[PDB]
């Protein structure tokens, strides 16, 4: 079936160009009506950027004006987005979507953007890429109680976003809380919590998997008991 | 440009209840007896999903508890009965003309019974300490409503220097909220005090909820 996928830089320095690629799988770019580029600013506010018609013709949002350019490559089945003279107010999540004929009513049609990509985060900043420091959060108490027990991971001092944190490779899915990152001095700090039965830990092992693709960092911290 | 104005920005509804979000275009979006108004739903960490197009037509795979009506400049989306997996943001989008424009969106937060937090406090890792820093963190998980007040106290005195609080969206499971508060001090500043208290104030308790530890 049909699938759209964005790719491109996580970080771009101001005044530079931004090039994004949307790879379409299981459908031909010549088979659709139009192919869009839409972006979402932090705050969830959406802004449509432009599109390329199956006839290769285009239309762009006037606000973007002369900075945007959308092209394609029929042989590789990809359509591109180029944005010139970027600034910090261009930091957002970009999505490429397909507009297609939706057969509705008594044998008629209506065009809607029905299939979107996962989206790719793009941060425009001077700031240098920085790897995160992961710290285990073991309970300071002598486990003296019962019921459940809460453990956590502190991931700090990294740039840019995002960071992928998971537990026991994905085994631990329930009772997991990943708190949104919060910027402070060009550096992010985030934390994930996991509440598990007193039975498993420390008998069984709990591990938090942090992955920061921008720095290509992959770290595993085993939450081990505190003491001396 | 056609400005789509959505009301309200957010609304709380109990499951079973009826939720109705409105969307208003600054100009009529009709043509050949067809309203060019669509609706998308977006859950956190995901792309907008199409729900209804042409004002009232549902997409494939979308349950009939979703309805949409209107014409001209006024349109509304209706959910009944509101299920647990409906918590998300809903945007209306007009295809009447180019440029295509969206609405600011409406956050649908689910209503449930009050729930007190499960507070957990954590001293800094010895691993972080060697690097000369110290982050004492405090988790406040699974509470309802999201209204909560977090205060830190070093040796009885308040402390706001160095604190960073973060909030998770509503959980699509139990419909609760969670929050982490991190106090970051230098290795030295940390060693210059004893009692570290993470004190919370929630609608579910007359007195403050408190977790603490001493060095």
């Amino acid at each position: 079936d049909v699938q759209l996928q964005q790719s491109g830089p996580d970080l771009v320095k101001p005044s530079q160009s931004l090039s994004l690629t949307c790879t379409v799988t299981g459908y031909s770019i010549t088979s659709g009506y139009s192919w869009h580029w839409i972006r979402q600013f932090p705050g969830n506010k959406l802004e449509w950027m432009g599109y390329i018609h199956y006839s290769a013709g285009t239309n762009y949002n006037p606000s973007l004006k002369s900075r945007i350019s959308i092209t394609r490559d029929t042989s590789k089945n990809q359509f591109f987005l180029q944005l010139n003279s970027v600034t910090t107010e261009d930091t957002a999540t970009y999505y490429c979507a397909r507009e297609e004929a939706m057969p509705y009513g008594n044998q008629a049609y209506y065009y809607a953007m029905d299939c979107w990509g996962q989206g790719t985060t793009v941060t425009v900043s001077s700031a240098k890429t920085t790897p995160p420091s992961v710290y285990p959060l073991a309970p300071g108490s002598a486990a003296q109680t019962n019921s459940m027990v809460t453990l956590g991971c502190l991931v700090k001092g990294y740039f840019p976003e995002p960071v992928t944190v998971t537990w026991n490779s994905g085994s631990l899915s329930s009772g997991v809380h990943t708190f949104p990152a919060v910027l402070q001095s060009d550096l992010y700090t985030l934390s994930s919590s996991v509440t598990v039965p007193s039975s498993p830990r420390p008998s069984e092992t709990v591990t938090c998997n942090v992955a920061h693709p921008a720095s290509s960092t992959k770290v595993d911290k085993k939450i081990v008991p505190r003491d001396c | 440009d056609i400005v789509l104005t959505q009301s309200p920005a957010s609304l709380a509804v109990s499951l079973g209840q009826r939720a109705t979000i409105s969307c208003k275009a600054s100009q009529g979006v009709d043509f050949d007896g067809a309203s060019f108004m669509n609706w998308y739903q977006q859950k956190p960490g995901q792309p907008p999903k199409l729900l209804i197009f042409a004002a009232s037509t549902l997409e494939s795979g979308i349950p009939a508890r979703f309805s949409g009506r209107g014409s001209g400049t006024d349109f509304t989306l209706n959910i009944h009965p509101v299920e647990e997996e409906d918590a998300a943001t809903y945007y209306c989008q007009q295809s009447h003309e180019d440029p295509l424009t969206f609405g600011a969106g409406t956050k649908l937060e689910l209503k449930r019974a009050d729930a007190a937090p499960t507070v957990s406090i954590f001293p800094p890792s010895s691993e972080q300490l060697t690097s000369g820093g110290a982050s004492v963190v405090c988790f406040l998980n699974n509470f309802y409503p999201k209204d909560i007040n977090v205060k830190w106290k070093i040796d009885g005195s308040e402390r706001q220097n160095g604190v960073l609080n973060s909030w998770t969206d509503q959980d699509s499971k139990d419909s609760t909220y969670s929050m982490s508060s991190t106090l970051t001090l230098t290795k030295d500043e940390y060693e210059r005090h004893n009692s570290y208290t993470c004190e919370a104030t929630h609608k579910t308790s007359t007195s403050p909820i408190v977790k603490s530890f001493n060095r």
Binding site: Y33, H53, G57 | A34, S95, H96, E97, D98
Partner: peptide, 11 residues
């Protein structure tokens, strides 16, 4: 059947 304001039509 595309909107009157759309730069490109469908047929």
């Amino acid at each position: 059947s595309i909107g009157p304001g759309r730069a490109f039509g469908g047929g």
